[PDB]
Amino acid sequence: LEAKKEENLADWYSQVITKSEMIEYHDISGCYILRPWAYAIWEAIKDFFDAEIKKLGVENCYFPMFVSQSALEKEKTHVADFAPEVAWVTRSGKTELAEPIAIRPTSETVMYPAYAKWVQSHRDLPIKLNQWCNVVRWEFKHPQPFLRTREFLWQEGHSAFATMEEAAEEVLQILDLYAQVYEELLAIPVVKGRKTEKEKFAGGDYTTTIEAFISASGRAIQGGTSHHLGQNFSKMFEIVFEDPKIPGEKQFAYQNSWGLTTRTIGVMTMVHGDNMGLVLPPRVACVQVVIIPCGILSEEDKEALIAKCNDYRRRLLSVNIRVRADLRDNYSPGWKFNHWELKGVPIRLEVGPRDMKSCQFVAVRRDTGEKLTVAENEAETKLQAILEDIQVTLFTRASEDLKTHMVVANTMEDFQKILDSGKIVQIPFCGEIDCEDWIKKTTARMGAKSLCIPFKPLCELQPGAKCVCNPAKYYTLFGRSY
Amino acid sequence: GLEAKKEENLADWYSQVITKSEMIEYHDISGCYILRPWAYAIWEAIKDFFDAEIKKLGVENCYFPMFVSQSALEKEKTHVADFAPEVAWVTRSGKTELAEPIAIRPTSETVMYPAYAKWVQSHRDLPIKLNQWCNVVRWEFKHPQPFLRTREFLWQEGHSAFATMEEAAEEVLQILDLYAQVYEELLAIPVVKGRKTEKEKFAGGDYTTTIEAFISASGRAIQGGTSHHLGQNFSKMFEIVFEDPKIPGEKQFAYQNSWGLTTRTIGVMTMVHGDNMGLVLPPRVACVQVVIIPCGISEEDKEALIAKCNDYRRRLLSVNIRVRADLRDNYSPGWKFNHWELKGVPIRLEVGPRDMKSCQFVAVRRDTGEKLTVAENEAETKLQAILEDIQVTLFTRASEDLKTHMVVANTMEDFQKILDSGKIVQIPFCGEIDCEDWIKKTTAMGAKSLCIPFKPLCELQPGAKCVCGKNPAKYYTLFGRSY
Numbered sequence: 001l002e003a004k005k006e007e008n009l010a011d012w013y014s015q016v017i018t019k020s021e022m023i024e025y026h027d028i029s030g031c032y033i034l035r036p037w038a039y040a041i042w043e044a045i046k047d048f049f050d051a052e053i054k055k056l057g058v059e060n061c062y063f064p065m066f067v068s069q070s071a072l073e074k075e076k077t078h079v080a081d082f083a084p085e086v087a088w089v090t091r092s093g094k095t096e097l098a099e100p101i102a103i104r105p106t107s108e109t110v111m112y113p114a115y116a117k118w119v120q121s122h123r124d125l126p127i128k129l130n131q132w133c134n135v136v137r138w139e140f141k142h143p144q145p146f147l148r149t150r151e152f153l154w155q156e157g158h159s160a161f162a163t164m165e166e167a168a169e170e171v172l173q174i175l176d177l178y179a180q181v182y183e184e185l186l187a188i189p190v191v192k193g194r195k196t197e198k199e200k201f202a203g204g205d206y207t208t209t210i211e212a213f214i215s216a217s218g219r220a221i222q223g224g225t226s227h228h229l230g231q232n233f234s235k236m237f238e239i240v241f242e243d244p245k246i247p248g249e250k251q252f253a254y255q256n257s258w259g260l261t262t263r264t265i266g267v268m269t270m271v272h273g274d275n276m277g278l279v280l281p282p283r284v285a286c287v288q289v290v291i292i293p294c295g296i297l298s299e300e301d302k303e304a305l306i307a308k309c310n311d312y313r314r315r316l317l318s319v320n321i322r323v324r325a326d327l328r329d330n331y332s333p334g335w336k337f338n339h340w341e342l343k344g345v346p347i348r349l350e351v352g353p354r355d356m357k358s359c360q361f362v363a364v365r366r367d368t369g370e371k372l373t374v375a376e377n378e379a380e381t382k383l384q385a386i387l388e389d390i391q392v393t394l395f396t397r398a399s400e401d402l403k404t405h406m407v408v409a410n411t412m413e414d415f416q417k418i419l420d421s422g423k424i425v426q427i428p429f430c431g432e433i434d435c436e437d438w439i440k441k442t443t444a445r446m447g448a449k450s451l452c453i454p455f456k457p458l459c460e461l462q463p464g465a466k467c468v469c470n471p472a473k474y475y476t477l478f479g480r481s482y
Numbered sequence: 483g484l485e486a487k488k489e490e491n492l493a494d495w496y497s498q499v500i501t502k503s504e505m506i507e508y509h510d511i512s513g514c515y516i517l518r519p520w521a522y523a524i525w526e527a528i529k530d531f532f533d534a535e536i537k538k539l540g541v542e543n544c545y546f547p548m549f550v551s552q553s554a555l556e557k558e559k560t561h562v563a564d565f566a567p568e569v570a571w572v573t574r575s576g577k578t579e580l581a582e583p584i585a586i587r588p589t590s591e592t593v594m595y596p597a598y599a600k601w602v603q604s605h606r607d608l609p610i611k612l613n614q615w616c617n618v619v620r621w622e623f624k625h626p627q628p629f630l631r632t633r634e635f636l637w638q639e640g641h642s643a644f645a646t647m648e649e650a651a652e653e654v655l656q657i658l659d660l661y662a663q664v665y666e667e668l669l670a671i672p673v674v675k676g677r678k679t680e681k682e683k684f685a686g687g688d689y690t691t692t693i694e695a696f697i698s699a700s701g702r703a704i705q706g707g708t709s710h711h712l713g714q715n716f717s718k719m720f721e722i723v724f725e726d727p728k729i730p731g732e733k734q735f736a737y738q739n740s741w742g743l744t745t746r747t748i749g750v751m752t753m754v755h756g757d758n759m760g761l762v763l764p765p766r767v768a769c770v771q772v773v774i775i776p777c778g779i780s781e782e783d784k785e786a787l788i789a790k791c792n793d794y795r796r797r798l799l800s801v802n803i804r805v806r807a808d809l810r811d812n813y814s815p816g817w818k819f820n821h822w823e824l825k826g827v828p829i830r831l832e833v834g835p836r837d838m839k840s841c842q843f844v845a846v847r848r849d850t851g852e853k854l855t856v857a858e859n860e861a862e863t864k865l866q867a868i869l870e871d872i873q874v875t876l877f878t879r880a881s882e883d884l885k886t887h888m889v890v891a892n893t894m895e896d897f898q899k900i901l902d903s904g905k906i907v908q909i910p911f912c913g914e915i916d917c918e919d920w921i922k923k924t925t926a927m928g929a930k931s932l933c934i935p936f937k938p939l940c941e942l943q944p945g946a947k948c949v950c951g952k953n954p955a956k957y958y959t960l961f962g963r964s965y
């Protein structure tokens with residue numbers, strides 16, 4: 001690592017994702033290779049979330065990636081301002097297709113016809129389907145590894161209910177899981193909220209969301225989305241059942257949708273990354289402890305030193321710690337120290353010849369850099385403890401960081417001043433789409449958009465407070481954003 | 483329930499089975515099919531087993547782009563263009579034509595190997611063992627069929643690069659053996675391992691291994707999985723080179739394999755084990771192995787009946803049998819019988835008032851239809867003993883079905899005779915591409931070569947000639963009509 005995250009952020013991010021062997025660049029703009037080090041993180045997220053949504057009775061499936069032209073255009077499913085982001089297959093070989101086919105940017109236009117056919121009575125609900133898949137969006141904003149990629153991996157759930165009550169409970173549940181992904185797995189604090197009228201999904205009833213902060217940018221980022229669609233989509237797609245006991249009334253399903261993507265890993269990179277490279281939260285690190293042999297001596301002695309490392313590897317596996325023994329002959333220990341530091345492994349387990357005679361080892365934590373001499377017998381207890389402290393340390397630093405950088409303002413005067421200090425701001429807001437668009441352009445004279453209306457703002461709106469606009473309806477979190 | 487019959491309809495029987503089982507929903511784009519939870523859960527199981535195994539072998543999972551640049555794809559003939567008509571091209575986002583069209587991966591060699599070349603600059607950097615689970619698109623000319631031949635499908639592709647051929651060649655047979663395990667131990671489908679002849683082998687490789695399975699009801703064979711040794715055909719094309727360890731200034735090319743397996747597995751499972759009552763699931767991959775259905779309908783009475791069903795339910799989870807109690811009130815047991823039968827749940831656990839007071843139940847195995855009266859105390863033991871018998875019973879019958887339909891012929895006269903009986907046949911083959919063409923057209927509904935069996939039925943008697951007549955036989959070759 002040569003750039004420094006506080007001075008050039010773009011270079012520092014580029015250098016940490018590549019030198020950590022997370023990302024390889026591709027020759028299609030906005031597309032990046034996910035090497036095993038980064039993909040393992042995604043798998044951890046995947047393993048957690050998936051387990052959690054199965055408890056809620058969701059089931060995993062897979063729907064076509066191809067969207068016919070008439071299907072995607074059939075309903076008012078998305079505003080006509082998304083259409084330029086849609087990538088069209090137009091020929092196979094050099095043989096032009098009779099009609100062009102779209103690559104899935106989201107799956108409503110492909111599963112909601114299937115839901116319509118599956119729902120023929122109250123018995124057919126609820127429908128709870130989820131797919132892990134790739135998604136393409138020909139983004140016009142600046143593409144960045146894992147923040148905004150023209151192809152990305154994600155999970156979308158689409159659900160269909162007989163009553164609004166059940167729909168509403170799942171929206172908040174799913175949002176809580178996303179918040180758990182970010183806070184307990186990646187050690188990133190987030191702010192739950194509801195999107196404004198401007199920033200909501202146009203075709204739903206209301207959009208909930210988690211927002212994350214990246215101090216080094218001063219910018220927020222949407223970490224996940226959970227819509228309640230009401231019946232706006234069931235009416236479009238005719239997802240209807242007819243209650244026998246309520247003759248003469250159609251029952252349109254109440255629907256939700258929700259998504260989360262590999263953008264998570266980018267956030268983790270920019271929140272916990274330091275000027276020595278990646279910093280993995282133990283919760284998601286595929287290697288929690290790397291064992292490195294030091295001090296190279298007889299051949300039998302050398303084999304004995306390797307034996308001790310692999311003994312440590314076996315003890316640690318037995319207590320469900322993910323451990324790698326870097327026993328490679330071809331690199332020096334110093335080289336391995338730097339290598340696994342760039343990769344961001346939580347703990348390096350250092351063991352030399354005079355330590356195995358001494359019945360001790362060295363632990364170095366990636367976050368603090370503090371060295372520790374630990375008795376050999378107390379390895380499981382001490383290394384488990386240290387992993388739990390790194391996670392709580394990483395979440396604490398970022399929590400204390402988010403507290404610091406998110407403050408309340410009631411004047412656009414202060415709001416403009418605080419915003420330019422690289423902070424995000426909860427202001428009294430009139431909700432109007434115009435007032436939001438005035439704030440956005442005035443904050444450039446890099447404008448400020450709305451992030452979320454917090455479910456639990458910092459400060460309660462004093463009755464009859466006016467918007468910074470119209471009276472204020474709710475405190476709204478505003479800021480510059482990714 | 484199931485209206486078509488596998489022995490006469492077949493085509494419609496297959497449509498009726500995959501849909502009424504809730505595996506497949508049809509899509510409006512030709513050769514594209516929705517995987518519903520029931521189908522997907524099978525593929526889930528295969529992923530779980532195979533992913534565990536390749537990890538034991540030191541392979542790592544990753545995810546490479548779906549888009550392939552035109553230069554990277556046409557860079558080097560990593561296929562003959564010949565495969566060209568199968569490639570779907572994106573030419574525009576929204577209304578706006580891209581400067582250069584980009585392809586949707588039909589395989590990932592041209593996307594991954596430029597990365598390998600940059601990652602290899604020394605002896606140390608090998609081996610590379612990467613694998614991705616992903617979707618792939620091929621505009622198939624043949625008639626599309628659910629999971630057999632789809633325009634889009636799901637697979638894993640394992641690409642690996644080695645310093646030496648000894649390591650590479652060892653892996654190819656390991657992966658192939660794994661692939662055979664997916665088919666024979668998970669899906670109870672017997673396969674024959676073998677290598678492809680010159681004609682049917684992958685042009686981009688040195689040799690191709692494969693497992694072939696037989697679908698009797700069809701009279702055709704199907705290829706279940708592919709493991710190539712790429713030799714050094716790709717490393718030369720993408721300049722994946724490492725410095726010779728002994729000799730200054732000299733580089734060596736890497737030895738590569740690639741290998742893949744798709745959702746087609748699920749279709750073959752359906753064609754082999756499916757019957758005229760619908761799907762039949764091997765317990766190994768059956769997400770619901772036993773369904774508990776209550777029979778015989780005061781409210782005091784159902785009070786106790788359900789209680790004993792959920793009782794049966796906790797006991798079976800306690801031995802990690804995957805069990806589902808269908809206690810739904812809105813459905814008659816008869817509907818539920820037919821419902822889980824069509825899905826092919828290995829065992830039906832029936833509980834009525836008659837036998838709850840009897841302290842016993844009935845188990846109905848989906849394979850044989852065999853109903854067994856079971857004492858309640860022996861529920862953990864007996865139902866797992868049944869589960870395992872079901873699995874080996876499915877494989878025994880599918881094995882002996884394959885026994886019946888794969889036979890030896892030494893004359894093109896007999897070869898044509900047995901092939902038109904709806905069978906596949908190992909014949910002495912000279913291996914030349916021209917002979918393979920003539921074998922195809924003379925049987926023409928032509929017969930293609932399937933593999934050269936690693937362990938053929940009979941040893942070539944010394945000096946035996948091919949079935950053509952001009953050239954001597956080099957190897958027995960499994961021939962047949964194929965998908």
Ligand SMILES: Nc1ncnc2c1ncn2[C@@H]1O[C@H](COP(=O)(O)OP(=O)(O)OP(=O)(O)O)[C@@H](O)[C@H]1O
Binds near residue numbers: 152223260263482
């Ligand atoms: N191009 C992208 N690359 C990676 N992740 C993305 C991308 N677009 C969206 N996401 C993530 O996917 C989740 C679901 O996306 P959704 O479509 O609901 O929002 P959106 O249109 O992406 O929003 P925005 O562009 O304001 O980020 C978002 O919460 C976001 O974290």
Ligand SMILES: Nc1ncnc2c1ncn2[C@@H]1O[C@H](COP(=O)(O)OP(=O)(O)OP(=O)(O)O)[C@@H](O)[C@H]1O
Binds near residue numbers: 629633635707742746
């Ligand atoms: N259209 C398809 N749908 C589903 N599975 C397929 C399809 N084409 C190939 N497969 C399977 O995917 C694997 C990938 O190997 P490969 O691409 O070399 O197949 P192939 O030689 O094109 O197959 P085939 O001649 O049977 O179509 C094969 O083992 C095959 O069983």
Ligand SMILES: Cc1c(Br)cnc2c1ncn2CC(=O)C[C@H]1NCCC[C@@H]1O
Binds near residue numbers: 082086105107108
């Ligand atoms: C380019 C584009 C199109 Br075309 C259509 N709709 C789009 C879109 N970009 C964002 N959306 C909204 C969207 O995807 C809604 C939810 N889908 C289910 C998972 C969670 C998502 O939040």
Ligand SMILES: Cc1c(Br)cnc2c1ncn2CC(=O)C[C@H]1NCCC[C@@H]1O
Binds near residue numbers: 560684710740742
């Ligand atoms: C349309 C097409 C092109 Br363009 C290029 N190559 C093709 C192809 N159809 C089949 N192949 C061969 C292939 O996929 C090789 C291996 N890939 C890795 C997994 C195992 C596979 O067998």
Ligand SMILES: [Mg+2]
């Ligand atoms: Mg967007």
Ligand SMILES: [Mg+2]
Binds near residue numbers: 199222
């Ligand atoms: Mg948004």
Ligand SMILES: [Mg+2]
């Ligand atoms: Mg093919």
Ligand SMILES: [Mg+2]
Binds near residue numbers: 682705
């Ligand atoms: Mg082939």
Ligand SMILES: [Zn+2]
Binds near residue numbers: 911917949951952953
């Ligand atoms: Zn011949």
